[PDB]
Design a protein around this ligand. Sequence first.
Ligand SMILES: CC(C)(COP(=O)(O)OP(=O)(O)OC[C@H]1O[C@@H](n2cnc3c(N)ncnc32)[C@H](O)[C@@H]1OP(=O)(O)O)[C@@H](O)C(=O)NCCC(=O)NCCS
Ligand SMILES: CCOP(=O)(O)OC[C@H]1O[C@@H](n2cnc3c(N)ncnc32)[C@H](O)[C@@H]1O
Length: 633
Amino acid sequence: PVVVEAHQVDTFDVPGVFYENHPHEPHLSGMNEYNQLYQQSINDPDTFWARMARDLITFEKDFDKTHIGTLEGGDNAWFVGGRLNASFNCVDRHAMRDPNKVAIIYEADEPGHGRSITYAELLKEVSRLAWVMKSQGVRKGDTVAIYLPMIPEAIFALLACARIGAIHSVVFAGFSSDSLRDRTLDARSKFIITTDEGKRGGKVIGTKKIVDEALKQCPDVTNCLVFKRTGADVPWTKGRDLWWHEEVDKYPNYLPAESMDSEDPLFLLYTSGSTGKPKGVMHTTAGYLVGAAATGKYVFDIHPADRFFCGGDVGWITGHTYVVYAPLLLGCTTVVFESTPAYPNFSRYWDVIEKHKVTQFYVAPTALRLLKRAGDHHINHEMKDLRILGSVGEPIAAEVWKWYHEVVGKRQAHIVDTYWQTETGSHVITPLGGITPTKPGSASLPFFGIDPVILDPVTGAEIPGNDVEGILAFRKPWPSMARTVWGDHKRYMDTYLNVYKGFYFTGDGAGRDHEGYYWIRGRVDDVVNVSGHRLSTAEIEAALIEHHCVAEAAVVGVPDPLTGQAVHAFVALKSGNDNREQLQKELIMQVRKSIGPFAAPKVVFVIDDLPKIMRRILRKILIIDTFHEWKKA
Ligand SMILES: CC(C)(COP(=O)(O)OP(=O)(O)OC[C@H]1O[C@@H](n2cnc3c(N)ncnc32)[C@H](O)[C@@H]1OP(=O)(O)O)[C@@H](O)C(=O)NCCC(=O)NCCS
Ligand SMILES: CCOP(=O)(O)OC[C@H]1O[C@@H](n2cnc3c(N)ncnc32)[C@H](O)[C@@H]1O
């Protein structure tokens, strides 16, 4: 058995109770209609995607052609000639039909302190925030830096940017001032939106102070709009800082939506890679939205009356596509969850799902492991409407898949392990909720329009048939594919499209078993996934070298029972300090300062010299004889 994971792995059918309890009708009649539609999406994408786009997205001007360009040309364009606006499709068209339908359920950090926001209320808040940016000089095509925690104002900000055709560039609120600065400079943003403070798990995040530090080196930022989240006294810079609540009160509660081209940029999302600084992955407008709506509908079985709850942060692509764009495009309710799965206690996810009658839940296996370690007594909730259990970031493995399926889902929900990445925009290999039979540990089958191949890692040759393993690549473009790396299309080409010419390179290894099901093996480059966070080891090495006592640095990923992988750092010193215990703390702090707390290495080892650097020798072990003794200590 070449794909060793799939050996004697039975395939599980969709639970019968899923159909009998379903509030509506499934979007597909069964696996046969999936197969028909899938073959059409590969053999005639021009027809398949034109119909899908006209089903799901309201265009101001119809498009002339479904797709032009090729993978090797790096010139792909989708729905060319079309015009539309993302905020119109997420807000206006739903407010017009059903103004009092709840668009957003805000669950605050403290339980009992949220609110519900209707589509009409959302149109007001998006409109008047867009008025603020317009009045302060933001124009179509400008980037806007967003440094916000998980509050509904974050949705207001993304959609207000989209409404005027500004390009939002969301920076995860766990990033340091250095990381925020680098992203604001590269994007050349002149406007930033933040909070006075964030509250997460009962802890205060000093967002305004972090922004102040970053802006000292962003001289082109001329306004900082501050949302009063906590009311605490924060430093204030007159002439630059503005209060969200003071400014929006000045402006009307409606604003026209800017007419955007299908291929106008919608957002940038800075993303860590195998080498170099983070890349501003750029998504344009029509194709991204089509993919978001298509996966939201067919993967997550989203219907307009649903209450969809993605547990991912707006700072990441999961938050972009499935907290914001997909559910709002489809017109359902989305949950914005400010807290952690552990605050006030380990029942929190289920408290929220029960109070709001959540129908689909989307989670990371790290959170599941963390909760399973806490004990099954924290779960004692009916959650009658919960029929889809989504998982992302790493394979949800046997022990966790069983615990997610039995203890959380009561054998009534369909577990959908969705494989994708920032660069694909939306799900690309995934079961379809309520339709696709699954296997624990497997992402199952390609989504519509996704033509995956397994490549020999060295020769680059395609390996045909089933029970094969190698490099995961896609053979054809798809609507929501990232279109460039901001300011560096050559890097985009070299990273994704010139490695295996004619294919799109995922950076992941994979196996395709006897049934054609995919088994994601993980990154083949120097990217590690820690608590669902995509980290570059080269970035962490660069951060450690910023320390005055560090000469060389080597960072590797090692398996971790809770976080999947954990980053361990090896450092060689420049001259020799007599404070090695204290030096380790300053090294840890250096990474927390250069990147952010969440990227900190678990341990920083000090060696005389390092093994180009043979990182493979370090990853297996966790002067070759000396490091084995140094580790064994
Ligand atoms: C599982 C999870 C909830 C754990 O949260 P946690 O209790 O903060 O633990 P973490 O290991 O992530 O955090 C480590 C550090 O990052 C920081 N951090 C994490 N998330 C943060 C955020 N949203 N804002 C600010 N800081 C954050 C913590 O405060 C902590 O800092 P500290 O060293 O000063 O204590 C979080 O890691 C997570 O969401 N992982 C999943 C990512 C993902 O794949 N989401 C998609 C799901 S659909
Ligand atoms: C959506 C977050 O996208 P990113 O933060 O850009 O990380 C994307 C990288 O995470 C990994 N990955 C994501 N989903 C899965 C999964 N279901 N099974 C296995 N691995 C997965 C993979 O290595 C990919 O290349």
